[PDB]
Design a protein around this ligand. Structure first.
Ligand SMILES: Cc1ncc(-c2ccc(Nc3cc4c(cn3)cc(-c3cnn(C)c3)n4C(=O)OC(C)C)cc2)n1C
Length: 256
C-alpha cells in the first residue's frame, strides 16, 4: 500500500498507531527518507470534529517557526473526504519509553525536562493552554523531546488516565495547570509513581487531588534542585504554583 501527498509518493514501511478515524504510518519518500503520515478519514466527521483538526493543523503550522520542540509538519492535503499530514518521524513516544525504561538516568531526565518546558512554554506564548498533558503527548526524536499535539483534537494509541489532572480543573466542575501536569510527569521519572497512583478508585483519587488536608509524598533523593522543582510544581493553589519562565530560570535546568 502506497500513497501520494501533494504530487509526492510515500511507500508504507509500518503503521505506528491508530486513533479513531485517523491512522499514523511509518513511510518512505523517493530518496528513502522516513516520515510519519497522519491519515484522517473525514467521511463521517461532524462540523465540530472537522474544526478541531483545522485548528490543530494551523497551530502545528504557526509553531514550526517558533520552537524546535514542536513536531515538524512538512506538508498536508485536506479534501472534503480526508486529511493527509506529512510530519517528522520520532523513534518512540515518552509513555511507551518510560514504561520500557524503568529506572532513568538523572542527566537524561534533566534534558527531557528542559525540552518539555521549552515546548509547553511556546504553546503558552500563543495563548494555548494544553489542559490535559500526559507523557504520550511527547515524542523522542534525535535524542530530543518534541510535543506531538496540543490537546485541541483527538489523541491516538500505538499498534486515557487521570493522574496528571490539576486540582483547579476538577474544582471548576490557566497555564499553571500545565505546570501541575509536567510536575506529575517529572515526579514519575523521579519516584516511579505519579502523586496519586496509590488511590485505586477514580472517585477517591479525584478527591485526594482537590483535598489540601491530603499531603503528597516527597522522599529524599541526591538531587536537591529536583526535589524543590517537584515541591514548586505540585502546589494545589494555581496562584502559589511556579510558572514555566520561573522554572526555566531554576537551578535544576540552568545548573548541572
Ligand atoms: C513501542 C512503540 N509504540 C509506539 C511507538 C512509536 C514509534 C515511533 C513513533 N514515531 C512518530 C509518531 C508520531 C509522529 C512521528 N513519529 C507524528 C505523530 C502525530 C500524530 N498526530 N500528530 C499531531 C502527530 N505521531 C503519533 O501520533 O505517534 C503515536 C503513535 C504516538 C511513535 C511511536 N513505539 C516505538
Amino acid at each position: 500500500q502506497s500513497m501520494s501527498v501533494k504530487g509526492r509518493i510515500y511507500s508504507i514501511l509500518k503503521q505506528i498507531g491508530s486513533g479513531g478515524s485517523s491512522k499514523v504510518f511509518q513511510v518512505l519518500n523517493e530518496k528513502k527518507q522516513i516520515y510519519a503520515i497522519k491519515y484522517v478519514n473525514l467521511e463521517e466527521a461532524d462540523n465540530q470534529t472537522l474544526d478541531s483538526y483545522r485548528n490543530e493543523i494551523a497551530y502545528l503550522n504557526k509553531l514550526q517557526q517558533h520552537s524546535d520542540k514542536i513536531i515538524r509538519l512538512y506538508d498536508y492535503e485536506i479534501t472534503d473526504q480526508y486529511i493527509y499530514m506529512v510530519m517528522e518521524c520520532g523513534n518512540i513516544d515518552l509513555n511507551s519509553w518510560l514504561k520500557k525504561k524503568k529506572s532513568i538516568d538523572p542527566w537524561e531526565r534533566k534534558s527531557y525536562w528542559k525540552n518539555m518546558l521549552e515546548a509547553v512554554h511556546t504553546i503558552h506564548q500563543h495563548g494555548i493552554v494544553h489542559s490535559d498533558l500526559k507523557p504520550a503527548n511527547f515524542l523522542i526524536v534525535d535524542g530530543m523531546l518534541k510535543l506531538i499535539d496540543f490537546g485541541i483534537a483527538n489523541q491516538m494509541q500505538p499498534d486515557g488516565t487521570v493522574n496528571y489532572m490539576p486540582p483547579e480543573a476538577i474544582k471548576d466542575m490557566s497555564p499553571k495547570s500545565d505546570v501541575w501536569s509536567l510536575g506529575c510527569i517529572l515526579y514519575y521519572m523521579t519516584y516511579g509513581k505519579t502523586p496519586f497512583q496509590q488511590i485505586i478508585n477514580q472517585i477517591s483519587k479525584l478527591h485526594a487531588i482537590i483535598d489540601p488536608n491530603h499531603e503528597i509524598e516527597f522522599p529524599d533523593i541526591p538531587e536537591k534542585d529536583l526535589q524543590d522543582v517537584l515541591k514548586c510544581c505540585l502546589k494545589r493553589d494555581p496562584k502559589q504554583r511556579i510558572s514555566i519562565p520561573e522554572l526555566l530560570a531554576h537551578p535544576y535546568v540552568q545548573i548541572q
